A paper describes a structure:
Our group previously produced a promiscuous designer enzyme by incorporating the noncanonical amino acid para-aminophenylalanine at position valine-15 of the Lactococcal multidrug resistance regulatory (LmrR) protein scaffold. In doing so, we enabled the formation of iminium ion intermediates formed by the condensation of aldehydes with the amino moiety of the pAF catalytic residue, thus mimicking known reactivities of small molecule organocatalysts in a protein scaffold. Assessment of the Michaelis–Menten kinetic parameters of these evolved mutants revealed that the mutations that improved one catalytic activity caused a concomitant decrease in the other, i.e., directed evolution produced catalytic specialization. We successfully obtained crystals for both the RGN and RMH mutants, with one crystal diffracting to a maximum resolution of 2.45 Å for the former mutant and two crystals diffracting at 2.55 and 2.24 Å for the latter.
Comparing the structure of LmrR_pAF16 with the RGN mutant reveals an unexpected change in the quaternary structure. With only three mutations, the assembly of the monomers to form the homodimeric structure is markedly different, as seen in 3D-structural alignments. This is also reflected in a closing of the hydrophobic pocket formed at the dimer interface, where the distance between the two closest atoms of the W96/W96′ side chains decreases from 6.3 Å in LmrR_pAF to 4.0 Å in the RGN mutant. Accordingly, the pocket volume of the RGN mutant (∼800 Å3), as estimated using PyVOL,21 is around half that of LmrR_pAF (∼1600 Å3). The newly installed R18 side chain forms hydrogen bonds with carbonyl moieties in the N88 and N89 side chains (the latter was also introduced in directed evolution). In one monomer, the H-bonding partner of R18 is E7′ rather than N88/N89; this interaction also likely affects the dimer assembly and hence the pocket volume. These new interactions may “pin” together the α1 and α4 helices and thus provide the large increase in angle, from 51.5° and 52.7° for each monomer LmrR_pAF to 54.5° and 60.1° for each monomer in the RGN mutant, which in turn allows tighter packing of the two monomers to form the homodimer affording the resulting smaller pocket volume. We also observed an increase in proximity between α1 and α4′ helices (i.e., between two monomers forming the homodimer), which may be caused by increased space afforded for the Q12 side chain by the S95G mutant in RGN, allowing for closer packing of these helixes and gives a decreased distance between the α-carbons of these residues by almost 1 Å compared to LmrR_pAF. Strikingly, in the RGN variant the 2-methyl-indole substrate remained in the pocket for five of the six replicates, with a clear bias toward dihedral angles indicative of the formation of the experimentally verified (S)-enantiomer upon close approaches.
Residue numbers in the entry:
A (entry chain A): 4 to 68, 76 to 111
B (entry chain B): 4 to 68, 76 to 119
The structure:
């Protein structure tokens, strides 16, 4: 149940949200609550902190509309490599199980 | 380049590797290199850090022949909970895309 694994799962979900296009912090929370049948309510302050860190890192930018955030060009590449990485993970997991079988 | 996400991907692989049975560090590198057609070589240091954390927390124990690692009873439970969590993530993402595709069809019309 380690906190580094819960955080990786939460990062993966945020990555998929920002993949869709521009969003704002309360809209993200709304979307994840509905898509998780209520299981998962992201804390708004935590979300701002993560985003401030991503913004400082050039991964994310923002503009006023409500503040909206969107992936930068560096952010979109970081995301593509992250999803490509998970696809290879998925494929490696299949071959390891076929190899055992 | 997502560095914390690389570590989660390496952790995810290792969990499934240990699920298949006991192993040693370099045998794991071999098996995953074979299972990826040579594309992917796990960094040995990332591997050790994970195993040093898993060993300290009782998820894995080890034995000498070369050091081998095995999932403990606690490890199998931790593992099952990790896969439940990753499975719920997969469904949340599907629900996020079905909901966005729904909003978009209703917005064309």
């Amino acid at each position: 149940i380690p906190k580094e694994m819960l955080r990786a799962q939460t990062n993966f979900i945020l990555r998929n949200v920002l993949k869709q296009g521009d969003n704002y912090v309360y809209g993200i929370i709304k979307q994840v609550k509905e898509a998780s049948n209520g299981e998962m309510e992201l804390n708004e302050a935590t979300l701002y902190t993560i985003f401030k860190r991503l913004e400082k890192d050039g991964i994310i930018s923002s503009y006023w509309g409500r503040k909206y955030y969107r992936l930068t060009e560096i952010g979109h590449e970081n995301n593509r490599l992250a999803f490509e990485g998970w696809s290879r993970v998925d494929k490696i997991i299949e071959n390891l199980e076929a190899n055992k079988k």
